[PDB]
UniProtKB/Swiss-Prot annotation, chains A, B:
Protein name stated in the entry: Glutamate receptor 2
Chain ranges on the Extracellular side, renumbered to this chain: 117-258
Phosphoserine: residues bearing it: 147, 181
Induction of expression: Down-regulated in the pyramidal cell layer of CA1 in the hippocampus by global ischemia.
Extra facts: The postsynaptic actions of L-glutamate are mediated by a variety of receptors that are named according to their selective agonists. This receptor binds AMPA (quisqualate) > L-glutamate > kainate.
Subunit architecture: Homotetramer or heterotetramer of pore-forming glutamate receptor subunits. Tetramers may be formed by the dimerization of dimers. May interact with MPP4. Forms a ternary complex with GRIP1 and CSPG4. Interacts with ATAD1 in an ATP-dependent manner. ATAD1-catalyzed ATP hydrolysis disrupts binding to ATAD1 and to GRIP1 and leads to AMPAR complex disassembly. Interacts with GRIP2. Interacts with GRIP1. Interacts with NSF via its C-terminus. Interacts with CACNG2, PICK1 and GRIP2. Interacts with GRIA1 and SYNDIG1. Part of a complex containing GRIA2, NSF and NAPA and/or NAPB.
Residues flagged as site, Interaction with the cone snail toxin Con-ikot-ikot: 61, 145, 237
Residues included from the entire protein: 414 to 794 of 883
Annotated function: Ionotropic glutamate receptor that functions as a ligand-gated cation channel, gated by L-glutamate and glutamatergic agonists such as alpha-amino-3-hydroxy-5-methyl-4-isoxazolepropionic acid (AMPA), quisqualic acid, and kainic acid. L-glutamate acts as an excitatory neurotransmitter at many synapses in the central nervous system and plays an important role in fast excitatory synaptic transmission.
Amino acid sequence: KTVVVTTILESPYVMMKKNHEMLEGNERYEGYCVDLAAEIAKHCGFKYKLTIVGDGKYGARDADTKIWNGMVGELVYGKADIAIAPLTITLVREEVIDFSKPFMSLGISIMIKKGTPIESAEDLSKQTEIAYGTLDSGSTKEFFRRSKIAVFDKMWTYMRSAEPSVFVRTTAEGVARVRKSKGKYAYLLESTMNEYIEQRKPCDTMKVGGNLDSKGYGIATPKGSSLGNAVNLAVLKLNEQGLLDKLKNKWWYDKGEC
Amino acid sequence: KTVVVTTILESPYVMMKKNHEMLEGNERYEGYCVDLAAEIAKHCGFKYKLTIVGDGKYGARDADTKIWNGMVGELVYGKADIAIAPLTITLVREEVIDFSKPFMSLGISIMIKKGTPIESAEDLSKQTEIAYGTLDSGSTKEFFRRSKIAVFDKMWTYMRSAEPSVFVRTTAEGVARVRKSKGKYAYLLESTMNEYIEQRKPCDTMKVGGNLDSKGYGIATPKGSSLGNAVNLAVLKLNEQGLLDKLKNKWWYDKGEC
Ligand SMILES: N[C@@H](C(=O)O)[C@H](O)[C@@]1(C(=O)O)CC[C@H](C[C@H](NC(=O)c2cc(Cl)c(O)c(Cl)c2)C(=O)O)N1
Ligand SMILES: N[C@@H](C(=O)O)[C@H](O)[C@@]1(C(=O)O)CC[C@H](C[C@H](NC(=O)c2cc(Cl)c(O)c(Cl)c2)C(=O)O)N1
Ligand SMILES: [Zn+2]
Ligand SMILES: [Zn+2]
Ligand SMILES: [Zn+2]
């Protein structure tokens, strides 16, 4: 009865410990979600195996095939018991899997190279010298596509039409584009990742502005799972013990480089 | 099949409309939670009657008698079908009722009279000229009592034995105390209330510093309620439509007096 935990290699949530690539078991991994998994398992009393999601995806339903990929798919199709990862709680997902209460809050935020004269989304939408974009298939893009806020609608119209593309294939590519673009590119991404990258060498990026929206990460289990209730109370307990904030501080700031 | 909704009279969540003392029905009430109930009801397809919690309490279990008071009491003792109110999601409550995903995020924050030279909790912790405190019974006090964080334990050491007492019996008392103390008292309270009060005449208080913790308000239903699932999905849907942010803006800022 070892619980299969699906997760995704994403710093600082889940990372290969230095020189552990040829070792085995859960002990290979470190990070915020590894710490959280250990605490969840301790409090619900189960043994578990951390497994990295095969396709490296979080979880979206293919428009055409209607098949769920990523961690959500591993839960929906019965290949994992629990997903402990920075998995956003969303309507479409909650329709097919169960989420705990959020263990971390976040929102959409702007990443700039230090010195870029931009302080807000409004600032970006007013000008054209600084290009801006987001992940090509992501939550951020969808936020802008659906938004009725004038400023965000203005940004969406600029982004959808800009040429060559302002969208990027991965977060790493978004960050590289900010870093290499001499202040002429800003990247819109989850605040949690923005604040992480701000603490990494070469310390040349900054988070600016308030968050544009408000969402949370949750631990996910298959519908009807007998683990769901326990995991949920465990998340609330860990929050009340200050453990979630302690873990955030540890992996973002105590281990920070700036 | 009219759903009985319990709530509590707390601005700007639920308020008596001006001069409506002698009027009847749902129409007497206005506010953020009144607007939210109307959305939840519409999206889940039910008719409802708003009632104000009998005993004016949120929901605590009497340590001795183990009886639940307030809105939690009304769900668990069968007097109301759903609570839509600024009810914090906590471990002890989630053991006896179900919570929706949070519709609003919040945390402990600092309220000062404008002009007071304090910018953060750490600032407060390093001095004694400005007294500071919290509701004498409630989440905030317990947060500080429990906290292993240096600055917070230091503040708890101070408040525990402060004289005259730094604690206040109600929230209006805490606010009044800030307002009347000529800059010599700071009040620790929910960030949502802090930012509401900041927009209310006489516009003489200020919210300072980041939040000291993170919590959420959720809609509460009894275990096994036939409403739980739909309400949870409605809350996610409203957040994604941008409606929860639109509501917060409406009741805090659009109707603000400052
Ligand atoms: N925490 C992640 C997530 O839970 O998917 C992020 O939201 C992330 C992103 O920023 O978009 C990280 C990469 C990943 C990409 C991709 N996700 C999406 O396509 C997506 C995600 C959400 Cl939450 C959504 O509402 C919509 Cl309309 C689409 C993934 O499946 O690998 N999703
Ligand atoms: N939104 C309210 C809540 O849901 O009870 C507040 O948290 C509030 C407070 O700030 O304490 C407002 C009045 C009310 C008082 C009282 N509740 C408590 O005493 C309490 C509440 C929480 Cl969330 C908690 O973690 C602990 Cl350890 C104790 C009551 O329920 O009327 N609780
Ligand atoms: Zn090792
Ligand atoms: Zn523990
Ligand atoms: Zn609606």
